[PDB]
Amino acid sequence: NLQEFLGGLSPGVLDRLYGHPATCLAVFRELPSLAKNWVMRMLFLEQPLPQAAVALWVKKEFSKAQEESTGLLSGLRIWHTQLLILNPIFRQNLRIALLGGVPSLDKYAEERWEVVLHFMVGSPSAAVSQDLAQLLSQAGLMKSTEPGEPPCITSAGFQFLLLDTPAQLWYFMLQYLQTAQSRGMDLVEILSFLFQLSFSDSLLNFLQHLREFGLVFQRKRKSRRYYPTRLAINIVVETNYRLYAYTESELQIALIALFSEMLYRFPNMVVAQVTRESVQQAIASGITAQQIIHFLRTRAHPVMLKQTPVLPPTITDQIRLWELERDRLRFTEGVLYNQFLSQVDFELLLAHARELGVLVFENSAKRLMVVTPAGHSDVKRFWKRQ
Amino acid sequence: LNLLVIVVDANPIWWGKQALKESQFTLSKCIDAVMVLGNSHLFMNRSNKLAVIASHIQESRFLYPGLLTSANEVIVEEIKDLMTHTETLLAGSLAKALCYIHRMNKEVMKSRILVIKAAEDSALQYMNFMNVIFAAQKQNILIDACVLDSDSGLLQQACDITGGLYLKVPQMPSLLQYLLWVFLPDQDQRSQLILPPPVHVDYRAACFCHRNLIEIGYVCSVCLSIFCNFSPICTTC
Amino acid sequence: VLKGVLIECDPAMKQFLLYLDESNALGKKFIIQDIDDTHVFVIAELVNVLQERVGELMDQNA
Amino acid sequence: LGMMRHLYVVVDGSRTMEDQDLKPNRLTCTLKLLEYFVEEYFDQNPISQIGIIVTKSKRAEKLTELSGNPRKHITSLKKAVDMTCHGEPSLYNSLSIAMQTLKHMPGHTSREVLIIFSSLTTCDPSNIYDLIKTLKAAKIRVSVIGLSAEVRVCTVLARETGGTYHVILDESHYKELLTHHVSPPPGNTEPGLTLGGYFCPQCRAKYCELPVECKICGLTLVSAPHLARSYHHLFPLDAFQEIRFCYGCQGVCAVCQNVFCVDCDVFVHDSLHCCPGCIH
Amino acid sequence: HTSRPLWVAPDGHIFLEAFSPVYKYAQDFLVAIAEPVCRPTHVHEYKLTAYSLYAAVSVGLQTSDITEYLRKLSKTGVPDGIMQFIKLCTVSYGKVKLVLKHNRYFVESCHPDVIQHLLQDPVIRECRLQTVSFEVKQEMIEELQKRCIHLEYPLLAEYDFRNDSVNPDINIDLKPTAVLRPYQEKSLRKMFGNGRARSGVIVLPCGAGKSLVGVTAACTVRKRCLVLGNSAVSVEQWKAQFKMWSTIDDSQICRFTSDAKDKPIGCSVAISTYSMLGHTTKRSWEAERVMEWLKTQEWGLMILDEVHTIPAKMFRRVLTIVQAHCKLGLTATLVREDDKIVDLNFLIGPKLYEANWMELQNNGYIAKVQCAEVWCPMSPEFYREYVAIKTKKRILLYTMNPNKFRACQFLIKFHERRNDKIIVFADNVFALKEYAIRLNKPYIYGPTSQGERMQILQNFKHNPKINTIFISKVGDTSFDLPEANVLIQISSHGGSRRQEAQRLGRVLRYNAFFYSLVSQDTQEMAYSTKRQRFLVDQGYSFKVITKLAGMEEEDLAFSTKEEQQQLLQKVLAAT
Ligand SMILES: [Zn+2]
Ligand SMILES: [Zn+2]
Ligand SMILES: [Zn+2]
Ligand SMILES: [Zn+2]
Ligand SMILES: [Zn+2]
């Protein structure tokens, strides 16, 4: 998420971050419902309005949406108290954004992006590039446990595969930025270049990495100016558990076969079936069923996207109901101590056990206290010394 | 989502009157209030649409169709072309406005129309003004309005049949701050914010022969045509 | 003081574990002490061989 | 198109209104669809009227007087759910009460009675067959909606005075019968337009947010947009002959000579009801 | 390429897209060619078979009308394993004809070169005794029809009824009072194709015109019909549907069900049952003189109601006792266990018309059913004994579940407050008593009578006070159950997907909706997915209600554990 990353940051970088058209429009584009209204209202103001009038601009109904908005709005340090004038590094550059101060494009963008997603499955046309191979492992979606000729795929790597196309691109860039503090450049110029792409010497090396996932295009082996692609902006399912996907690409076939089993393969159409024994093969690695319905709700046919609610509700709960078979019997381990002749001394052992957070379950019939074995070493020190 | 049509009263008689009145508010400082609110509607969401219609005498061109720097040069070129039967026709532009909303709603959305009226209300179009209101009411299209000099009688009914707002601004050069506060929020955020209430509603009817506004008059019972104080016979049927 | 771990499940599924206690299908003292009709204390070594007994019973009525 | 109407609604209040075969109270399912009936009557007919008479224990008592008040009727039908409804009804006493007021209306209207009738027996102290010669003389139009059977009076009262007699299949047929009684069958009044909030110009009396008549001076107060929806039926727009760049949406009329597309053509005649070029 | 909404698979399977502009002119083509396998709301799936093409060329389309219109609606190109199969199974149709004439059965061929091929099989030489003919025995007509399919020269039963000049053409005329819906007009058009009647099987829902098509087919051939049925109640309906829509006097509509016998010798329409014509014991004297009359008269249009019981051992001997020219079969649930529905393709003929069960719902001919498989958890005292025994005593345990007793009592209360007509179908008749006396509700126990069976059923329809009824295995046919609105099915037979399409027949005769009570984590969970296997192939969607809408708040039975301990001691005492 973007406001998750921008919330936990220093004030000394956000003032540098607010670029001339780039970041001031980008942060303002992601503000929940009402934070866009107050930023617009006091954009042309110069005298700071009183801080108590802001809560009076909202009805008493839907007041809980006010504090979560201004908490995020003051969390990014857009205004301050000052006695609520906006930041002059933000109010000026946002007012610059209000007018102040190629069929080869998309086909290159999709093909250069599937060969990165093909690296997380079995394919002979692997993205042979030593920079990306260490990049995916330090992000935590390619298990190695060995130098190895093949790299494996962890449980988080399967969850990466069934995300949306823009949503899986942001998860990659946040783990590019979190590691670039100690191996690359400053955080300010790399993040302002991405937002300026959406509308120094170290930046060509970052541009040569965006060349490989596919967000720019050179066409003459790193010329002066680049050209951005469509990736740089930021299948029916029926009642009888059968899905008819119209994709002919090999990447979309291996994503469907992760959680279903296939029974025919025509050109330009592949029919599979969501069986019970194949969803249980998916959650065994753990691709849990909320991501399954989210994978089918984004990728859908226009005939699915009709006046009916998409992904009809007898198959969406059934995948949730097939998730709960793994759930029956929960494996939470503990240890036990009992057999006191007195009916009072175990009640004094409650007051020495709740405050650390070790007690798991309480029984008042036979006075059965269960604690975790990681926390069993400290509870016995009170019992032998009274 | 959130298609917003702006209908600006581009009557060259009243703006040219204020251009010689020296009231420090010309047409140029009013289209700037349209262009900034035009640019500000394209910021609150990624997929937001804009349309600007200029109401001239005997004609009415679309301004914006024919990132924001590709929007603002079209508007300043069309206004420089249009401003180069002395009463405005606001009803002919809202009929064009509902056609553009009906086309963009077929290619997919809630929409609204914001009218900035600057001339006096012509009562000669009461038969056609009410038809574009009831067409807007059955498609849940709000008709917001702000006036500059005097309360338009026909335009107050458009904001209460459909469900929009009506605000007479006190000052001309403070228009841009007023637009952002009371019209820049969309339909859902308008319920959460607090806004000025409607101060007066002006319901009248036009006579068929006089086309005059009437508080007490005679209606026919079969053809339902309201007449002024005559009652000699049923003129329509 | 005794060494043993916990398992919590549906009370309908809980009595299946009590059936495996008094039928000697897996071990002898497989449940150390029943604490509740919703929670069960089992021994820590047979926690994995128990899992395919439940997974077969969920697949015996597929 | 249509005419003015002065409809009366006679509601049966007999012992047989406690019967089943309907939503919990046979009386209650009658009063449920009547509240739906008053709304759709006043919507399609702007300046008409409704009286509601309830007959009970060989006598008729007027529940609501004849006035065009689309709020006073529904707020009185909600009160009458807890009615006793004992005894046998009448039909001479109920059509005469609906004749002492409905006769003196002017002759340019369509005076009507609508009887919703569940009992089988009309114990009334005189001859019914002299009313049907009187109601036919006064140009009233009595129509009955019958429940569970067909009575001989309600056929000869309907076909002589001019109305219809109909018997219920079920509740889906009972809503279908009341729906057919809102269309009017094919003068100069003086109403007072109530501008300024809701105040009366003739007597300057301030009252509630209503399309109702004024009690202090007797004037009827209507709202001109409500009258305005009934327009465009008279002089509607003629269709176009159809054989890119448009005039409506900007992306063929025989009057203004401005071309349309297909979405625009269907939109002009369906909802807009005017030609967008002709208003210029 | 974006058009032509099929995908002809190389073995044979036709994936039709039901969102195409030319779907209605490609769904009116695949009914005449293939047979439906699955029909969801988006992509249908038909299937080519051998018997489905014999019904294709029986209608006026030849072998070049099918194999060309597959190319023009292909999306792939026909895969050349279908051009070899369509040509093989269409040029061998009209070569060997089975025609009867005055009480003798004849195998006829116009081409003499196939009779010299046909008369070397050692089983067709057992059934013996231009225009080459040889007379075959009547009692070996079933073992003959297996062999003609076994060597791919199948028999056709096309009655040419327009001019025969032997049968006494009766005055049955369909009166202009019964107008038939546009799916009934399409099924009869595929039957009476070339002006000659055809022996097929028409699958229509029981709430649809399952009987109006049988009457209209009787007024069309206008020969001596013979209606059969599964029960003595089902023939008093067939008698009523002939007087309602066909203008026949009571001196011609007779019966043969051992109680009326309305002079069954010498009539025009005889409405009898199964197991009366195939009663293999010593018959009574009134039935002996009718069967001696019925075994010697050539009928026309035998109407076999409830076709899915014909491939039984005793009900398929009816088709050799009675001599009919054409044999129409009307059913509602064609599925049946033990794999004998493919055996029915030569007892009667090819499957003519199957109604689209979702097209009749979207047009208003069938009530919109909201199926809901509400499953109940098991009680912890009952599951203690469920896993301890295996020999059939646990069938009572997953039937008399106390937590399933609450969901039956709650769903009855929830629909009595909405004035809904409740039917509780419940087999395993010990738990019929213990369910219907703890709620004080009537029950058609099954060995009750003929008397109080008729008045409990009539106190259910024309009375707004008695609202529920507890049937037990009686309503598994086309009985007169009077238009229910919900149906709380509890613990029926094992995997009978014929049953839960006959329990569904009561509901469609949301508007109406039926439940299916399951005791979860038992053997009934595996059963209740075997029985929705037929209904999900028609378009129906079975929801799951794990927890009901506030079950614990009302006054439900079996609250305490003391009253629950007594029920287990009642169940376990049976043994
Ligand atoms: Zn006048
Ligand atoms: Zn008139
Ligand atoms: Zn007054
Ligand atoms: Zn025109
Ligand atoms: Zn157009």
Residue numbers in the entry:
A (entry chain C): 18 to 100, 108 to 125, 145 to 242, 255 to 289, 307 to 458
B (entry chain E): 8 to 73, 103 to 120, 128 to 151, 157 to 285
C (entry chain F): 4 to 65
D (entry chain D): 55 to 240, 278 to 334, 343 to 350, 359 to 387
E (entry chain A): 71 to 199, 266 to 645, 655 to 720
What did the authors write?
We prepared the core TFIIH-XPA-XPG complex bound to a bifurcated DNA scaffold that mimics one half of a DNA repair bubble. We imaged this complex by cryo-EM and solved the structure at an overall resolution of 3.6 Å (“Methods,” Supplementary Figs. 2 and 3). The cryo-EM density was of high quality and revealed DNA and all protein components except XPG, which likely dissociated during cryo-EM grid preparation. XPB binds DNA in the duplex region, whereas XPD binds the single-stranded 3′-DNA extension, consistent with translocase and helicase function, respectively. XPD and its associated subunit p44 move by ~80 Å, and this requires a flexible connection between subunits p44 and p34 and rearrangements in subunit p52. XPA forms an elongated arch over DNA that bridges between the two ATPases. XPA binds XPB and XPD with its extended helix and its intercalating hairpin, respectively. However, in our structure DNA is held in a positively charged DNA duplex tunnel that is formed between the extended helix of XPA and the XPB ATPase. The tip of the XPA hairpin contains a conserved tryptophan residue (Trp175) that stacks against the base of the DNA 3′-extension at the junction. The plug would clash with DNA in the XPD pore but is displaced and mobile in our structure.
